[PDB]
Swiss-Prot record, chain A:
One of its GO terms (biological process) is transcription by RNA polymerase II. The lineage of its organism: Eukaryota, Metazoa, Chordata, Craniata, Vertebrata. One of its GO terms (cellular component) is RNA polymerase II, core complex. Its main location: nucleus. Component of the RNA polymerase II (Pol II) complex consisting of 12 subunits. Zn(2+) 1 binds at C6, C9, C28, C31. This is DNA-directed RNA polymerase II subunit RPB9. Gene3D superfamilies: 2.20.25.10. Transmembrane segments: none annotated. It comes from the Eukaryota. Zn(2+) 2 binds at C75, C78, C103, C108. InterPro entries: DNA-dir_RNA_pol-M_15_CS, Rpa12/Rpb9/Rpc10/TFS, Zn_ribbon_RPB9, Zn_ribbon_RPB9_C, Znf_TFIIS.
Amino acid sequence: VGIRFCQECNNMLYPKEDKENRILLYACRNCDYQQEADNSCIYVNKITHEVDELTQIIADVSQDPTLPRTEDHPCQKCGHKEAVFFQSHSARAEDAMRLYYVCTAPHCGHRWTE
Amino acid sequence: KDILCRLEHTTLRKVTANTAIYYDPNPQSTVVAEDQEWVNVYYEMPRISPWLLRVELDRKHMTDRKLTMEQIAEKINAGFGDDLNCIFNDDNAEKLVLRIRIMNSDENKMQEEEEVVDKMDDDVFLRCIESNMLTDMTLQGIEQISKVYMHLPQTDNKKKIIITEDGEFKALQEWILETDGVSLMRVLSEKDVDPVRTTSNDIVEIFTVLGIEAVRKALERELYHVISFDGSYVNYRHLALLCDTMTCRGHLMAI
Amino acid sequence: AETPEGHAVGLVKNLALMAYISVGSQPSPILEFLEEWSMENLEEISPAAIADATKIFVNGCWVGIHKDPEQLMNTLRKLRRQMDIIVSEVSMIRDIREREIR
Amino acid sequence: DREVLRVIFPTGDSKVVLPCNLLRMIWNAQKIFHINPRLPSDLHPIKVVEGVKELSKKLVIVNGDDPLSRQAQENATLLFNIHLRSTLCSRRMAEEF
Amino acid sequence: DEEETYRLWKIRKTIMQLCHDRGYLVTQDELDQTLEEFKAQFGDKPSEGRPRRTDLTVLVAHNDDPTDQMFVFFPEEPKVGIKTIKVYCQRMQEENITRALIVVQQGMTPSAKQSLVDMAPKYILEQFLQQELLINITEHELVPEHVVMTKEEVTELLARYKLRENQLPRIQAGDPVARYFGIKRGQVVKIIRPSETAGRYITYRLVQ
Amino acid sequence: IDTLEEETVMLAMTPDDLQEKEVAYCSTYTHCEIHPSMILGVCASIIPFPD
Amino acid sequence: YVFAKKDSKYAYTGECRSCLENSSRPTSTIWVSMLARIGQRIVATLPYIKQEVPIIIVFRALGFVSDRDILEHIIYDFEDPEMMEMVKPSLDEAFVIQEQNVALNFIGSRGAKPGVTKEKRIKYAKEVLQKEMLPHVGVSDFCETKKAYFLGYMVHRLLLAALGRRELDDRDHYGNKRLDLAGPLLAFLFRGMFK
Amino acid sequence: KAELEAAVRKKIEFERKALHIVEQLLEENITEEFLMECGRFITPAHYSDVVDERSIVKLCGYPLCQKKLGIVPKQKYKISTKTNKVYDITERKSFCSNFCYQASKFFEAQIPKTPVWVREEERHPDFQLLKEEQSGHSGEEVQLCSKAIKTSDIDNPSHFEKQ
Amino acid sequence: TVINNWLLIEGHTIGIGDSIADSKTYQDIQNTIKKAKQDVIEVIEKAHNNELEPTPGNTLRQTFENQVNRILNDARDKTGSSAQKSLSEYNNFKSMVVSGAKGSKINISQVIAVVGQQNVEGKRIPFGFKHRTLPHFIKDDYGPESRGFVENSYLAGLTPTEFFFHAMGGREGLIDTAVKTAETGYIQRRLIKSMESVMVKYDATVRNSINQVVQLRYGEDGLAGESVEFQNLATLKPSN
Ligand SMILES: [Zn+2]
Ligand SMILES: [Zn+2]
Ligand SMILES: [Zn+2]
């Protein structure tokens, strides 16, 4: 799923097969560097792609004046009464109209959907 | 809805939840822990490629289209044969998947310059196959009909107007489909599609399927619809004359 | 409201009454202030720090990164509201979600 | 003729476009001749039948004496004649008009 | 499988109606037989079965004179070429008949169809795909009634309207309903359609 | 304020109404309109009662 | 500005009309598109170059030979596995070229004047990347780690659009417009006449 | 005269091409030079008609081959692992052996592309192509020289030394 | 002429007070609008808590959009009707509309009741700033005020944002007008030059310039189009 980088030329490690032991290697094509993989996976296509948006939203948005605040949704982490809700607005999950909250107390920035 | 799913194009990409090209050399080992059991069901007694394209298909999307993986394997070896093995579980088990492996080229076809032509590695090859066979297997449908809307009509122009044995007109309400994309000749030749109705709003397709008089009548119907949409009224004389000028030469004449 | 009608409807427009089209300026005072206010250039940084810091563009050209963009926007506004270094017609947008200060 | 109409208009929309408002000429006549609708009429039903029969022969769109000309005539005035015979009925012209 | 029996049966039903329209003596019971009688008579099992493409091949005689007959040939081959159309012609040479009708599955190569027409005067042959016979188009809602005017009737027409054939509307000789009726250039189709202004209308079209 | 700095601001139309405590709509206003009729040009400032 | 090309061959296209401080030479638009549909490779439509150029070729022509040293300018958080697999298909179209000068040759081979000498084509591509690619970033002999950062920004922002993580740009928004009054118009008219 | 002789010339050309297809259909009585003088007439589409016609009759679409095509596979794609390519068997199904396919494809590749009306216009490049095609199919007759017999479903867009 | 002169005796005018409705109708329209507000508010709360289930076929966003447009168009039409039902007989707007002479009853609805929802390309006012329609609204506001619902009549006057959304949505009218006039002139000229030589000949056939039969009888019944008229058939409706 990720990119492995060589350790000599720092180019990208492409997967190849180890016949004599039949084990998946990652080998660089500018060196003879090889690395016995730990994944045994080469490529993953997520078509439905259930995504967490609680991970894209950065807590800095609690500094937005144009964002609606709330009181009847206290942060579970710190118990701060206020929050700052908004929607996804992302071409993938733009279909639903789910609200995410970002605790507005400084130093907390705890995101949560309900 | 059964005829609906028989008409609408269902490729493999619309069914797939996710894919994954594992490296799995000995299927009895089965790097994927979940498959391991039913895989030996095919390996109790049946070479193979180590690269394994594992497709997890969505379940609700195959309940809808009334698709079973049996038919997906059939579609696949219909295009590739047993050049490309497919394995599948039994459907009463959860998260039905499909394990595909490019079988091999058995012992012949020697002496060629394969390493010379810088052949793609087997993983890249299986991925190109996964795009070649994901874009379209066309498990169902007419490959020109993108979307299909089933619904009950309310305007009497699309209701089955019969004459009761009493002698009076009665409007029977019943389901009609509205596709998107025309394959008239293929559509109206299948079971439980009314061939004596089932028009189209494409007069070139009507001209090629049903002829010049049918395109005259349908062209008049479409003009009448476009014009009578906003409650307007044009006499039939004028529509008839326009549609007689447009089609009196044997073919469709734009003006 | 004010537009012609016919073939140029909506193509010819008119300013509102208090709308002012800015005349231009020089970014050099702002660039010096930014350097002096703990903004790291695009040479004295490691692209590992560029990740959770705030880009800082000035006239399109990406000029640096800053690790406290809240305090920086307060400072730049407080300066434009006195006409110290930043003239009054200088725009200072902060994309909070995009992490940029243009 | 009713069974013919059920073929021409299979949807059942009876509003057609024909070249003579017959329900208005019948009204012009009821007014021009001061027809008292409270009195026994003196119009013989056979006279209605025979009169519309000979009227339908003066409404000539395709002048005949020719099998295909006679067929084109019968088609050209097939709907107006159905109308004319169902409004200048003998039952209607004796209990309605 | 039962699906191919359905398609064979539907095509045979369309061909029975197509021969009935062209004026061939088709018995009424053979004109409307449901799938069950088709199975019982032919086999209901197309693959590995008696109801093969061949052995469902109809020879119907015209109504004016039973000398003028017509075959409808279902070739077993998916595609059809010059060799099989020539064996079909030399078969039509016996029992002295001249109309044939080849119901192909994938069609014919342009050279093969060109060789089909060069047998113009003695063996009028003509090709029909399966896909076109799975429905009778003359039973659609949009398709009016077409009758084929004998030569005496078209002569009487033109002498009554003082017309020349090049003054009539035109229908192409490869029109679907012109292919259905086996109409060739110079013939006149008579389209009867019901009109909402007059009640009925008879237009004529010249096959160009 | 210019047209893209105007997307980070939270305008009020009138002080007399918008920044008065009530059932809260927004309470983080950052700017205020001088007069909302300054949105009109020279030839539309002649029209009386254009609303 | 990242827009979505309706059809063509690009799913997304991110342009940047660049102009120097004092508009000595006119604006020079550079595009960075992502082909529709290995995978969706990224190409860079440079000025004074007739063909598209793989983006990693343009990053190697600037002197960032390696492959981590090209994604550090494009992907600022390496623990984003979803954005990296979008650049994987493009670190392959430029797999053959692993050095700066063969990349500069690859670029100069597409110019307006395809010279005969490898050295002359290299120098042509060198000055086209040094003066006509993103001039607002700088025109100098060391404005290359700033053009790399800015072109990595354009690529990263094209990826954010393709991942559906940022709205495509509105062409009618007025933050995206500038009005040329009698000052800019007449200064543009006076450059030519003093020239 | 101008278009009247045009009609009669290209109609005699039609029936001549018809019996050309018929000679092609023959199981033998086709010599290599017979094939030369017939391919003198045949156009691309016409040779495609040849191969389809004989493929229908379970006879190899190539003139020189007389092997019967007893069984034909139903699959549309044949993926090879010797080299890594998916091959489109949609014409190879028309032949009995691989070298026959390559021979025929090479033959119509070296067919005259100018239309038959202006083909016998110049017999100079025509017979040039005739001895050309004889040499080519002879090389095809001795040996195949490449096991790539089913076109190529190309899906490889990466560049090699296009620098 | 005789009507112009009787109108010298009688006179017709239009003024304020024709545009004003009694306090009963004002309360009716205010309550209709307030109900529509709180109904869109509860629909929005459904969407924000996921109790909204997409109607079969389109989306969840399009489900919400159709539901809201439905509520708001019902509000506008109910206000328009509840206003026109209060127009006195002494009112001159009623005089205008019931004889169909001038204006539509929707015009008078907007003058008296509510201007209603403004649409740009069929949808509510687009989110033209970043996630808001104007810099006066909070990000992600789907309420009716935010997306273009003008809830004032032209007698009460539009607030500054309603004024702008109305200008936005009424420029679409000005552009549609121009594009429609252009397309229409084109279609008219194409028709007119297509069928301009077709004419009934002296043997009743309709023929074109090449003297080719288009119709064997005009309108396939032979009658001129102005002398015909709508009539029922009377043997096409009853039972046996
Ligand atoms: Zn390496
Ligand atoms: Zn908190
Ligand atoms: Zn062979």
